[PDB]
Design a protein around this ligand. Structure first.
Ligand SMILES: O=P(O)(O)O[C@H]1[C@H](OP(=O)(O)O)[C@H](OP(=O)(O)O)[C@@H](OP(=O)(O)O)[C@H](OP(=O)(O)O)[C@H]1OP(=O)(O)O
Ligand SMILES: Nc1ncnc2c1ncn2[C@@H]1O[C@H](COP(=O)(O)OP(=O)(O)O)[C@@H](O)[C@H]1O
Ligand SMILES: [Mg+2]
Ligand SMILES: [Mg+2]
Ligand SMILES: [Zn+2]
Length: 420
């Protein structure tokens, strides 16, 4: 026998940084995959928060809003919040099967700064302009790298795949009930130069439940990936934009990708991509994962056009939008909470993403499994995982900014359609 320190919360010192590599990133988090050898972190990624350079856990109204869970609102810092929110809110609605909720790790302000320097190269100019890494969390989250187990993993950020029916949408905003917000949004994204090409994808095809509308969706995506489609080869990008959105696939990158699916997809040159896509579509349609998700999203029972009102009650500030419908203000404050919390929850579900791993059975290391795909026209069997990512809680305050963003979306669409 020998004597060792008692147990202690691991801490990531200013030396472990060179173990991590740039993965991707959103508006809210950094993500780096693991390159070092320590068994603990192998097959893991670190999700490190950043700070918009114009910047306690929960505001007073957010405490009351999420109060139905004492452990949640009493979160020290945002990693526990992130943990408890997936743990006691999301998985109840979503099921633990396709979420792999996260583990905290302490980190030194020095470690962060080291990662911050190490990625800036791989990061997109305007992401560097808009946010460095937030070097005053003590913590960060470690997750299973949902592109591992050759392993081909594809990521789909579906967005909201239903159309509202609220009695509070106005005649003028009548389009909102027949055009997905995603399509209209695209117009506003084009005017602001954030894409080059209106995207072929319509999340209605994905959330339709038609094994045939879904393949169109997956076909659309590969065509115009923007920032909703990504395909990896063992932790590397091969289709999609890294940390950002990317222009329509071209003849040159489709012929590059194509010659990449070599030896994973077994089909003659110029046939693998149409195969790979059938595979993705069938993983998505077969796993049924996309269904329960669209149930969460539909906790938007009133659309932001009606929900904003309940928001102004919550924060007990007189309602701007009204102009002298009591109906929504005459609610008991308790009911007005439920709509806004269910709104926020729904927001988590429209902004989340799906990762799908693959292990071809044409490789001898094949650990079979009851979730798999048999791709009829090449005779290959593929075992696959489907997991969620970016189930972050959203701030009560984005409500106001949500309403404004909606207004501009349906105002601007109405516009370009009046032209004709
Ligand atoms: O950058 P991404 O990783 O893609 O995600 C960003 C936002 O996430 P946050 O980082 O939490 O803000 C996301 O959710 P929000 O927080 O706004 O609810 C937005 O969705 P929407 O605004 O609701 O439509 C995104 O817009 P679309 O991707 O076009 O949906 C995008 O905004 P950006 O372009 O300014 O970064
Ligand atoms: N657990 C994970 N496994 C593999 N890739 C991930 C994981 N988490 C995030 N990523 C990748 O890094 C990106 C970071 O985004 P995300 O974690 O959703 O934070 P944000 O709030 O910034 O959108 C994702 O779009 C995803 O492709
Ligand atoms: Mg994201
Ligand atoms: Mg997020
Ligand atoms: Zn009102």
């Amino acid at each position: 026998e020998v004597l060792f320190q008692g147990p202690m919360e691991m801490i990531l010192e200013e030396k472990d940084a060179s173990d991590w590599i740039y993965r991707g990133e959103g508006g809210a988090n950094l993500v780096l995959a693991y390159a070092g050898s320590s068994p603990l972190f192998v097959g893991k990624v670190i999700r490190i928060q950043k700070a918009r350079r114009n910047d306690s856990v929960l505001t007073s109204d957010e405490q009351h809003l999420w109060r139905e869970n004492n452990e949640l609102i009493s979160s020290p810092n945002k990693e526990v919040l992130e943990q408890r929110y997936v743990q006691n809110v999301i998985i109840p609605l979503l099921g633990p099967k396709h979420v792999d909720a996260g583990v905290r790790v302490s980190v030194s302000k020095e470690f962060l700064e080291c990662v911050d320097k190490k990625v800036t190269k791989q990061r997109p100019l305007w992401r560097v302009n808009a946010a460095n890494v937030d070097t005053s969390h003590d913590s960060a989250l470690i997750l299973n790298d949902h592109s591992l187990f050759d392993c081909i993993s594809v990521e789909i950020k579906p967005k909201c795949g239903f159309l509202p029916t609220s009695r509070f949408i106005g005649k003028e905003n009548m389009l909102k009930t027949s055009v997905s917000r995603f399509k209209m949004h695209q117009l506003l994204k084009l005017e602001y130069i954030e894409i080059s090409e209106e995207s072929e994808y319509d999340p209605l095809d994905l959330f339709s439940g038609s094994k045939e509308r879904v393949l169109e969706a997956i076909k659309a995506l590969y065509s115009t990936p923007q920032n909703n489609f990504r395909v990896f080869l063992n932790g590397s990008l091969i289709l999609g934009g890294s940390g950002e959105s990317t222009g329509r696939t071209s003849p040159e990158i489709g012929y590059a990708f194509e010659d990449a699916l070599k030896g994973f997809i077994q089909s003659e040159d110029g046939h693998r991509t149409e195969c790979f896509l059938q595979l993705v579509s069938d993983a998505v349609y077969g796993s049924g994962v996309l269904d329960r998700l669209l149930e969460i999203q539909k906790l938007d029972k009133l659309d932001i056009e009606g929900a904003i009102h309940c928001y102004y009650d919550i924060i007990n500030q007189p309602c701007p939008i009204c102009k002298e419908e009591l109906s929504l203000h005459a609610l008991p404050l308790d009911e007005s909470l439920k709509i806004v919390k269910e709104y926020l929850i729904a927001a988590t579900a429209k902004d989340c993403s799906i990762m799908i791993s693959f292990q071809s059975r044409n490789a001898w290391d094949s650990e079979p499994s009851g979730d798999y795909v048999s791709l009829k026209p090449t005779n290959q069997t593929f075992d696959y995982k489907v997991h969620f990512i970016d189930l972050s809680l959203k701030p009560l305050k984005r409500m106001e900014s949500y309403y404004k963003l909606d207004k501009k979306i349906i105002s601007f669409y109405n516009r370009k359609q009046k032209a004709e």
